[PDB]
């Protein structure tokens, strides 16, 4: 539970092919995790049930400064998933420059500043 949680893909064994480098190993491992993560955002495969307490009436989605409203809980989960994937994307792109990220993925740009964007290594 909690909003701070690394969502893992359980049941995916990764047998590393020999002749890989430690960087390339991760890239192979992360690619599988990336697709599986994306599978998760694609179909909603979370395996994480909502709290029973949540059926109590909740406030309606907040608007952005641009006046655009969006979904709050849906988006929180889906965006979080994209961040898991992105975490791997940034890692895999660093490990392999020739890596091709998924099509729904878009690289980070300084267009976003609605929150605090602090880079991570």
Curated annotation (Swiss-Prot):
Domain of life: Eukaryota
Residue(s) carrying Phosphotyrosine: 63
Entry comment describing in which tissues the protein is expressed: Detected in lung, ovary, adrenal gland, colon, kidney, muscle, pancreas, thyroid, placenta, brain, liver and heart.
Cell compartments where the protein resides: Nucleus
Region named Disordered: 41-70
Residues passing through the membrane, by range: none
Residues modified to Phosphoserine: 56, 58, 65
Function summary: Necessary for the ATP-dependent first step of spliceosome assembly. Binds to the intron branch point sequence (BPS) 5'-UACUAAC-3' of the pre-mRNA. May act as transcription repressor.
Subunit and interaction comment: Binds U2AF2. Interacts with U1 snRNA. Binds EWSR1, FUS and TAF15. Interacts with RBM17.
Family classification: Belongs to the BBP/SF1 family.
Name of protein: Splicing factor 1
Species annotation: Homo sapiens (Human)
């Amino acid at each position: 539970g909690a909003m701070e949680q690394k969502t893992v893909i359980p049941g995916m064994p990764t047998v590393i092919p020999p002749g890989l480098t430690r960087e390339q190993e991760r890239a192979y491992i992360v690619q599988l995790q990336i697709e599986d993560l994306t599978r998760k955002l694609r179909t909603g495969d979370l395996g994480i049930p909502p709290n029973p307490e949540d059926r109590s009436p909740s406030p309606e989605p907040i608007y952005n400064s641009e006046g655009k409203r969006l979904n709050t809980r849906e988006f929180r989960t889906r965006k979080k998933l994209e961040e898991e994937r992105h975490n791997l994307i940034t890692e895999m792109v660093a490990l392999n420059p020739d890596f091709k990220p998924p099509a729904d993925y878009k690289p980070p740009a300084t267009r976003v500043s609605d929150k605090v964007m602090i880079p991570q290594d």
